[PDB]
C-alpha cells in the first residue's frame, strides 16, 4: 500500500506491484502466469520457481532468447476464412459474458 | 501528537442549546464540544455553528405536516452549558418544495433583498404557481409573462414592506403563522389566480453586531 511519501512514487509503483501479487498468493491465490510465446511453441511460467528460473537466465541470453529458446538444448533442458471465426469464436464469448453483468 | 489514551469524546462535554424567546421551549438539542484547555476554548468553537431545526419542533406540532419551515439558527453566544442561538434563516424542506412543482403550470419566483430596521439585510425567495380554475377542461393553465413579470413585481413590492416590518422580535412571528403568504394571494388574485404560495428561503447575510442587551432580552 505504501502511504510513505518519503519513498519513491516512481519506484513504489512496482513495490505496489510485486507485493500485491505475493500477498494474494500467500493467502490462497495461484501464482501469476505469463506464457512466453516463442517460435510456434509455448512455455508456461506458472509457479514462482520456473518464473524465478526464467528471470536470471535472460540476464545471460537476453536479447537472443527467442533464437535460443528454439535452438539451445541446455536452456531447453533447464526449462523443459478459417482463422477469423476461431479468433471471433472467443471474442463472442467475452462480449456475451463481460456484458451480462454490465449493469 | 495528541494521542489521548481513551475517548476524545470523554473530553467532549454536552452543551444544551436554547432557542430565542419567540417560538416555544428552548432546549432543542445537545452539542458536544471538547472540554476546554489552555489552547482549547470551549466558548470558541461554538460560535460558528448554524443549527438546523424545524418549525414544528418550535410550535408544539405533534402531527408533522407544518414542519417545512426549517428555521436555521446560528449558535451565537454561550454561557454555562447554554448557548443562546440567534436566528439565521429559514429554508423550506425539499419534500414540500419539490412536491409543488408539477408540470402543467407556470411557476413565478420573486427574490428580494431588503434590510430591516435592525441591521440585518435579508433575501426572501417567494414561490408561486398558477391555480387551475374550476370547470377548466384545458390541461395547462399557463400565465402570460406580463402576467408573470407583473406578479414578480407584485411580490417584490409586498414582501419588502414586511421586511421593514416589525422585525425579528415580530417578523419571525409573521413567519410563525405564515401571514405573508396570505397577503400575496389576495393581492395577486386581481391579476391571475395563484396556486399555493410560500417564501421558501431567507438569507441573513448582513448581521450587524451583538447587542447583548437586546439579545438577553431576545432570550426572555
Amino acid at each position: 500500500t505504501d502511504s510513505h511519501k518519503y519513498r519513491a512514487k516512481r519506484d513504489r509503483k512496482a513495490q505496489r506491484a510485486t507485493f500485491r501479487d505475493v500477498l494474494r498468493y500467500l493467502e490462497e491465490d495461484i501464482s501469476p502466469e505469463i506464457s512466453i510465446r516463442f517460435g510456434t511453441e509455448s512455455l508456461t511460467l506458472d509457479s514462482w520457481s520456473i518464473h524465478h528460473q526464467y528471470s536470471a537466465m535472460c540476464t545471460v541470453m537476453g536479447p537472443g532468447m527467442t533464437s535460443q529458446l528454439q535452438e539451445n538444448e541446455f536452456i531447453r533442458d533447464i526449462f523443459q476464412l478459417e482463422r477469423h471465426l476461431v479468433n471471433a469464436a472467443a471474442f463472442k464469448a467475452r462480449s456475451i459474458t463481460r456484458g451480462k453483468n454490465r449493469d | 501528537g495528541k494521542k489521548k489514551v481513551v475517548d476524545p469524546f470523554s473530553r467532549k462535554d454536552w452543551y444544551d442549546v436554547k432557542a430565542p424567546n419567540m417560538f416555544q421551549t428552548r432546549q432543542i438539542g445537545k452539542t458536544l464540544v471538547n472540554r476546554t484547555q489552555g489552547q482549547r476554548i470551549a466558548s470558541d468553537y461554538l460560535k460558528g455553528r448554524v443549527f438546523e431545526v424545524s418549525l414544528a419542533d418550535l410550535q408544539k406540532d405533534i402531527d408533522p405536516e407544518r414542519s417545512f419551515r426549517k428555521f436555521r439558527l446560528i449558535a451565537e453566544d454561550v454561557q454555562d452549558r447554554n448557548v443562546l442561538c440567534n436566528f439565521h434563516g429559514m429554508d423550506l424542506t425539499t419534500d414540500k418544495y419539490r412536491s409543488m412543482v408539477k408540470k402543467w403550470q407556470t411557476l413565478i419566483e420573486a427574490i428580494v433583498e431588503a434590510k430591516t430596521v435592525d441591521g440585518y439585510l435579508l433575501r426572501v425567495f417567494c414561490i408561486g404557481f398558477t391555480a387551475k380554475d374550476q370547470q377548466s377542461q384545458r390541461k395547462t393553465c399557463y400565465a402570460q409573462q406580463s402576467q408573470v413579470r407583473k406578479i414578480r413585481a407584485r411580490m417584490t413590492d409586498i414582501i419588502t414592506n414586511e421586511v421593514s416590518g416589525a422585525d425579528l422580535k415580530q417578523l419571525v412571528n409573521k413567519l410563525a403563522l405564515d401571514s405573508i403568504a396570505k397577503d400575496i394571494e389576495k393581492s395577486c388574485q386581481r391579476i391571475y389566480p395563484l396556486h399555493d404560495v410560500y417564501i421558501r428561503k431567507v438569507k441573513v447575510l448582513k448581521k450587524p453586531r451583538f447587542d447583548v442587551s437586546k439579545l438577553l432580552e431576545l432570550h426572555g
Binding site: - | 405533534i62 402531527d63 419534500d95 419539490r98
Partner: protein, 107 residues
C-alpha cells in the same frame, strides 16, 4: 425510408433544440428526442414502512418520496427496456397502454 412522421422526436418550427446529457451514459441527446421518465418513488420502498413506523416518534409522520425527471438516450432506454420496439401499426400510438392497474415503481 422514412420511419417516423416526426423523424426523431417533436421539433416543430424551432430550427434547433438544446441537448441534455443522458442519465446513465452521459450522451448528448436533445431535449425533445429524449425518453423522459419522471419518478416519484418512496424512500423506504414499501417493506421498511412497517419497520420505520415502529421506530417513528410521531403519529406515523408519513414519509417523503423522491422527485427526479430522468432522461435517456434511445439506446439506454432500449437496453433498460423502459421503451421497446413497438409494431408498425403501434408505432403510431402515443396514448395507450396502462390498462391494468395503477402503475408500480412509485408505488
Amino acid at each position: 425510408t422514412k420511419k417516423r412522421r416526426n423523424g426523431g422526436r417533436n421539433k416543430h418550427n424551432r430550427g434547433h433544440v438544446k441537448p441534455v446529457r443522458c442519465t446513465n451514459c452521459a450522451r448528448c441527446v436533445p431535449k425533445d428526442k429524449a425518453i423522459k421518465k419522471f419518478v416519484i418513488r418512496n424512500i423506504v420502498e414499501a417493506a421498511a414502512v412497517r419497520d420505520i413506523t415502529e421506530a417513528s416518534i410521531w403519529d406515523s409522520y408519513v414519509l417523503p418520496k423522491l422527485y427526479a425527471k430522468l432522461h435517456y438516450c434511445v439506446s439506454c432506454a432500449i437496453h433498460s427496456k423502459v421503451v421497446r420496439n413497438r409494431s408498425r401499426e403501434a408505432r403510431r400510438i402515443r396514448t395507450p397502454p396502462l390498462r391494468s392497474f395503477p402503475k408500480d415503481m412509485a408505488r
